Design a protein around this ligand. Structure first.
Ligand SMILES: *[C@H]1O[C@H](CO)[C@@H](O[C@H]2O[C@H](CO)[C@@H](O[C@H]3O[C@H](CO)[C@@H](O[C@H]4O[C@H](CO)[C@@H](O[C@H]5O[C@H](CO)[C@@H](O[C@H]6O[C@H](CO)[C@@H](O)[C@H](O)[C@H]6O)[C@H](O)[C@H]5O)[C@H](O)[C@H]4O)[C@H](O)[C@H]3O)[C@H](O)[C@H]2O)[C@H](O)[C@H]1O
Ligand SMILES: *[C@H]1O[C@H](CO)[C@@H](O[C@H]2O[C@H](CO)[C@@H](O[C@H]3O[C@H](CO)[C@@H](O[C@H]4O[C@H](CO)[C@@H](O[C@H]5O[C@H](CO)[C@@H](O[C@H]6O[C@H](CO)[C@@H](O)[C@H](O)[C@H]6O)[C@H](O)[C@H]5O)[C@H](O)[C@H]4O)[C@H](O)[C@H]3O)[C@H](O)[C@H]2O)[C@H](O)[C@H]1O
Ligand SMILES: O=c1ccn([C@@H]2O[C@H](COP(=O)(O)OP(=O)(O)O)[C@@H](O)[C@H]2O)c(=O)[nH]1
Ligand SMILES: O=c1ccn([C@@H]2O[C@H](COP(=O)(O)OP(=O)(O)O)[C@@H](O)[C@H]2O)c(=O)[nH]1
Ligand SMILES: [Mn+2]
Ligand SMILES: [Mn+2]
Lengths: 263, 263
């Protein structure tokens, strides 16, 4: 645990870095005994790298990997997600025997160190197509073999969604049909889309939520937050505002724990 | 071939009966060798019951069971779905050893008799909360024991969503974590919402779809269809129109196979 296992996140810029900082802070809040690592690319400013170094045990600099797959990315109206191929570098971290990758738009609500009981590749179902796993939280084993296989697949075939999730689902294609232990409970990767879409289920199961995932184009750091009243401005049709306490928690952690580190 | 196995659907009115008729027509189109059964309630007109007897091998009259659960039904803005507890009568059908229940708003695209290789309770994940199964397609074993247990649970505790899906998930609570063979592939219950929500997945996995499920308040029979050009009128934000060929298939089956028996 102490030395050989890690939580790993990714940021390619200073905007998603705010997410990584909140994520990291939340993992510390719930007393993880594992290492905290962030993959960062050159667009992350030197000053932001130094702040990341105050929350994460290590900031590892990597090259951007970009699908350039405009056709598939436009299908999802997420033209900016080609750089998510950069996530594949997480397999290069052979200093660790086992890691949990978490998207920089996640937030931890409870200690989730029991994820290290799982084996590669363990992930939660994606609400959009639930025979695919969501690649925002997953348990994997760093490996030079797997790393290079994934790079090769990405170069030769690309990804069916132009980002990491398509290629990871294609590589780890047995997930839907083999080994139910590699299905993480949905409470380890609770997309705000699910709360909005089937509120009765959230009402009975949502109290057990361990990780919330602010999946979608609008991210927590794109809201206007008032720390005096603890509210955000919001617009119509916003699944983040079905149970807005997760978004306010994000902002509370940012305002109280991250904002002083930005001084 | 199995004279002791059946597909089973439900209609409490003449509107959903149009759905049942198209479903049963589609099961015949794809050469099922099993029996076709429809549970119908007193609000189904006598003329419609007679038409149902042309498609279905058995039309079984049952009493409406209604949750009356306005609080939970309004959370999903589906105030009409309390009558879905009537589905529980499917477990009374002890003349069959095994059955597949299918919602009246489903449509079969390929032979699915291989579902009878599955054991109770086998179902596909729900896109809204994917640690719940969707109760629109499920493999079950009729049983007086199970029937009465479900009725009793429904009377004492009700359903967390006011309809059958909540209570069925509560009763068959091991589904998410036990026996991956009881996870039907999502292609056996493909919700239109999923096509709309993660189109790249539909583009690579969707050609294999076996069953489409027109889940949501607007049903196929509510569209205005022009048989001359094979088109429907549609409004903004319609997940059914992402891949509208499923809706058009519904209408082509209705127009050619079913409408002439009604009008
Ligand atoms: C829909 O059509 C209109 C939009 O075209 C819509 O109007 C909307 O306007 C708002 C947009 O500004 C919208 O906010 C919503 O934002 C999300 C849309 O971005 C929406 O969630 C939906 O869209 C997401 C995509 O962002 C779908 O996720 C799917 O695709 C993701 C990648 O694009 C997957 O992420 C995964 O893959 C990454 C890349 O490989 C990987 O790096 C990640 O780690 C991994 O998570 C995801 O898995 C996959 O499912 C959602 O499925 C889909 O629900 C939110 O609901 C919402 O916040 C408003 O909702 C809306 O008003 C109009 O209303 C609709 O008819
Ligand atoms: C959201 O806010 C606005 C909604 O008011 C929305 O504006 C919309 O207006 C249109 C409405 O005409 C909308 O069309 C929509 O149609 C679908 C629903 O009507 C919607 O899908 C969403 O809603 C359904 C609810 O019907 C969710 O399903 C969940 O709940 C179901 C039961 O209610 C579950 O069904 C299951 O359970 C039954 C009862 O127990 C059982 O009998 C069944 O057999 C079984 O299937 C289901 O499993 C569960 O998931 C969906 O999850 C959810 O996606 C479409 O997305 C939507 O298109 C227009 O799109 C929109 O303009 C506004 O845009 C949004 O921000
Ligand atoms: O410009 C970007 C886009 C994405 N990411 C990283 O890739 C992940 C996946 O992207 P995102 O969460 O936006 O996808 P979603 O979950 O919304 O589909 C993020 O959480 C970040 O870790 C990044 O660093 N920079
Ligand atoms: O007024 C109704 C409502 C529902 N149903 C039956 O219950 C199923 C579940 O309801 P629906 O499909 O509308 O729910 P959804 O799948 O849209 O959540 C239907 O397919 C029908 O078989 C019915 O017979 N009459
Ligand atoms: Mn994300
Ligand atoms: Mn249905």
């Amino acid at each position: 645990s102490m030395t050989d296992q890690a939580f790993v996140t990714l940021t390619t810029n200073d905007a998603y870095a705010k997410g990584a900082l909140v994520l990291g802070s939340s993992l510390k809040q719930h007393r993880t005994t594992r290492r905290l690592v962030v993959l960062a690319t050159p667009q992350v400013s030197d000053s932001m790298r130094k702040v990341l170094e105050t929350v994460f045990d290590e900031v590892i600099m990597v090259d951007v990997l970009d699908s350039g797959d405009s056709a598939h990315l436009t299908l999802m109206k997420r033209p900016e997600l080609g750089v998510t191929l950069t996530k594949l570098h997480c397999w290069s971290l052979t200093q660790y025997s086992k890691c949990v990758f978490m998207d920089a738009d996640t937030l931890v609500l409870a200690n989730i160190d029991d994820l290290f009981d799982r084996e590669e590749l363990s992930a939660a179902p994606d609400p959009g197509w639930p025979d695919c796993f969501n690649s925002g939280v997953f348990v994997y084993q760093p490996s030079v073999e797997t790393y290079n296989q994934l790079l090769h697949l990405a170069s030769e075939q690309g990804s069916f969604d132009g980002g990491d999730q398509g290629i990871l689902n294609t590589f780890f294609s047995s997930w839907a049909t083999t080994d139910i232990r590699k299905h993480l409970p949905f409470i380890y990767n609770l997309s705000s889309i699910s709360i909005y879409s089937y509120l009765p289920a959230f009402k009975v199961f949502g109290a057990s939520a361990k990780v919330v995932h602010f999946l979608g184009r609008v991210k927590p750091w794109n809201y206007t937050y008032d720390p005096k009243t603890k509210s955000v401005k919001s617009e119509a049709h916003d699944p983040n505002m079905t149970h807005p306490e997760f978004l306010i928690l994000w902002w509370n952690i940012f305002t109280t724990n991250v904002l002083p580190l930005l001084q």
